[PDB]
Every structure is written in structure tokens, then in C-alpha cells.
Amino acid sequence: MIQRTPKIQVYSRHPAENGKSNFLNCYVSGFHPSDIEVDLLKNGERIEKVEHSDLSFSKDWSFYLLYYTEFTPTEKDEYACRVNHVTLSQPKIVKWDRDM
Amino acid sequence: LFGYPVYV
């Protein structure tokens, strides 16, 4: 049965500005089946209050979800998105880059 | 929303 890998993008809702409130996002899309494990990490640890959009899909039937949490970027804090899905031998971690 | 039952 069909299994499509999720594409992952980790970015902020607003251009990052140290000391200013924002939202850290992790967009997962083009995947199938729907079960997927998504976490947002701060300096490697799991962030607790992370919400996500309601499951929806594209015209090709592949799924997409937006995971997000409020945060204030600093100069030293590192962020990342750790995803897992049947199409991935191991959890995939993508670091947040202010310029991507 | 369609209001009528549809089964495959």
C-alpha cells in the first residue's frame, strides 16, 4: 500500500527578531498514511505546549499538518523539528534556520 | 454539507 514521505519545513511565522514574540512552525506535508509523530525541540528537549492544525489533504490525497508553538527567539536558543512516520527508518530532525 | 447518505 501507498506510503509517501513527509516533506518538512521548520520556520517562524514572523521574521525572527531576538526578544520579540513569535510562533515556531513545523509544516509536514505530502505524506501518507496519516499517522505521523511531530515534535518541536528547544535545545534538544521536547516542547510541551505544541498545537497543530486539523488534518487535511491536497488534490493528490497526500496529507498536511501545521505544528506550532509560541516562542521568543534569542541569540543562543536552538530549535528543531523531530518527525517520525512509517516511511522513515528513524526520526528525522530538521534544525530551524532563521533564513529558511 | 451534502445531506444525503452515500455508501460505496
Partner: protein, 275 residues
């Protein structure tokens, strides 16, 4: 200009771990406005957009009622399909259904849709003529016959051409500020040292709505399609979208490259240049 209304349904069987999971969402263009989650506490269709929040209980009870019904028929479909494919009971499977309507710039009915997918592949679709069905699998045949015999197309056509469209323009008027808006992209460029003889130029488009947008790079006014890194348009979380396009520029060649942005929120297309 043109508008759309679309309902998305996903049902996923949970062999042994209870009833199947069911999630429904409805959109107007690129703006989601309602949702229903079978695993949620309310057990009600809920608002996801400011404008639909004021509908009235008549609306909410009615939609909660019809969405529950969809939930149920999908629960039965999971069983039906398992049989059609002589599939095991221990297996988790997925049924998806999407239906809706499009109307042109004149706000008149232009196109209707109604389609199902089983485990990620097309199963059956109502053709554009909205009078015939497109079945792929041999299994899909059984379903196609059932619907032709029970005259399902006729019922959906009437709904897609009438009811669907009337509510679309009702939402368009009621949610005018949100749905009939346009947020032009806020653009900027970045320049980062790749090596000692190359640099990456990334052209950004942020805060725009609707999602549709064209973002390209040209070198001396010539297409750079195959030499451009384009990321998928993504949601910002606040109702707007984002996108970027990057190219690697051989040092001393920044002046040769132009970034072009087309979006309906722009009074005229943009031509950006690092300078």
C-alpha cells in the same frame, strides 16, 4: 475573481483500538472555516474562522448532524471496502472523500467535484459532466454500478449546482473582509556566502493571501527554472502564506539576476534585484 468551497473527510480504521478516527474540515478558497474530530470532546462541528462563528444554533446543530452522518457512512465504508479487497481485519486502512464547487469571477456555478480515495489511491470520482463516474479498480466498479442504479449522481449534481453554490456566496458576503481580501506579499532578499566564488540569493514572499503565487528568478531576463530552488508554499499560522526561491550566483554576477513575483494582491508584478 473565482472562488471555491470544499469539504475534506478522512476516516482511518483502528483495528482493535476502538472506532475508526474521523476528521472533517471545510474551506472557502484557502481559508478553513469548520472542523469535526471524532476523537474530540465536543462531538460537534466547530468554527475555525471568525466569520462563521456567528451563524446561530440552527446552523451548528444542522452541520453537526450532517457531519455525524458522514462519519457513520464512512465507518460502514471501511467495512465494505475491506470486503471488496478481501483484506485482513488487523489492517489499518484509510478512506478519504472530497467534494465541493467552484464559481467564476461572475460568481456563477463553474465546476463541481465529488471523489473518494482508498489507502491513498483514487477509487471513484464524479466526472466533470457530473452525470457519469470514473472508476479505476475492479472493486470501484461495484461501487460505480451501485451509484448509477441508485441515481447518486443526480442528487450530487443538484447539490453541487445549487445548495453548494448558494452557501459559497453567502459566506463570501458574510465573510467579505476575510474571504474577499487580498494580502500582497511582503518581499525581501538575503545574501549568504556559500564559498569564495559563489553566493546564494534567496527571494522571499511573506504574509500573502491567497496561496496562489508565482515566484521565479531570471539571469539576463532568461528562465532559470532548472537552476532554482523553490520551497513549497507554506502556512504561517495566521491565515497567510510564505514562499521562497533561491539561486546560486557566481561572484560578481548579482546584477544579472532578477526575482519576479506575481500575486493578485500586487497592483503589478515585481522585479526585484540584489543591489
Amino acid at each position: 475573481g473565482s472562488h471555491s468551497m470544499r469539504y475534506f473527510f478522512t476516516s482511518v480504521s483502528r483495528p482493535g483500538r476502538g472506532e475508526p478516527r474521523f476528521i472533517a474540515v471545510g474551506y472557502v478558497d484557502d481559508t478553513q472555516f469548520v472542523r469535526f474530530d471524532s476523537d474530540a470532546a465536543s462531538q460537534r462541528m466547530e468554527p475555525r474562522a471568525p466569520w462563521i462563528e456567528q451563524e446561530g444554533p440552527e446552523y451548528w446543530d444542522g452541520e453537526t448532524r450532517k457531519v455525524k452522518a458522514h462519519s457513520q457512512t464512512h465507518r460502514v465504508d471501511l467495512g465494505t471496502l475491506r470486503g471488496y479487497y478481501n483484506q485482513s481485519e488487523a489492517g489499518s486502512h484509510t478512506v478519504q472523500r472530497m467534494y465541493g464547487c467552484d464559481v467564476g469571477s461572475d460568481w456563477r456555478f463553474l465546476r463541481g467535484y465529488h471523489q473518494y480515495a482508498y489507502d491513498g489511491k483514487d477509487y471513484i470520482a464524479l466526472k466533470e459532466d457530473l452525470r457519469s463516474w470514473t472508476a479505476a479498480d475492479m472493486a470501484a466498479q461495484t461501487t460505480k454500478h451501485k451509484w448509477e442504479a441508485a441515481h447518486v449522481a443526480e442528487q450530487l449534481r443538484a447539490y453541487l449546482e445549487g445548495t453548494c453554490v448558494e452557501w459559497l456566496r453567502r459566506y463570501l458576503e458574510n465573510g467579505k473582509e476575510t474571504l474577499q481580501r487580498t494580502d500582497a506579499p511582503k518581499t525581501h532578499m538575503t545574501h549568504h556566502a556559500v564559498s569564495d566564488h559563489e553566493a546564494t540569493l534567496r527571494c522571499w514572499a511573506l504574509s500573502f493571501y491567497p496561496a496562489e503565487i508565482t515566484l521565479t528568478w531570471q539571469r539576463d531576463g532568461e528562465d532559470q527554472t532548472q537552476d532554482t530552488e523553490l520551497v513549497e508554499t507554506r502556512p504561517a499560522g495566521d491565515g497567510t502564506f510564505q514562499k521562497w526561491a533561491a539561486v546560486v550566483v557566481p561572484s560578481g554576477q548579482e546584477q544579472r539576476y532578477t526575482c519576479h513575483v506575481q500575486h493578485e494582491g500586487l497592483p503589478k508584478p515585481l522585479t526585484l534585484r540584489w543591489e
